[PDB]
């Protein structure tokens, strides 16, 4: 759990808020994605997916 690395920042979950990309199904940290806890989008597509 705690040490599982999935985000493109190559750093682990570590209990941090995360959001799953709807296109590549990768868990990304909210901070890395530039998303606030108070304003989570209903559909999330990560930057890697957006860059083609």
């Amino acid at each position: 759990s705690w040490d599982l690395v999935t985000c493109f920042c190559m750093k682990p979950f570590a209990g941090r808020p995360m959001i799953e990309c709807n296109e590549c199904h990768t868990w990304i940290h909210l901070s890395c994605a530039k998303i606030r806890k108070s304003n989570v989008p209903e559909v999330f597509v990560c930057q890697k997916c957006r860059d083609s």
Partner: peptide
Amino acid sequence: ARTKQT
């Protein structure tokens, strides 16, 4: 979105 720890 499918989130955790939010």
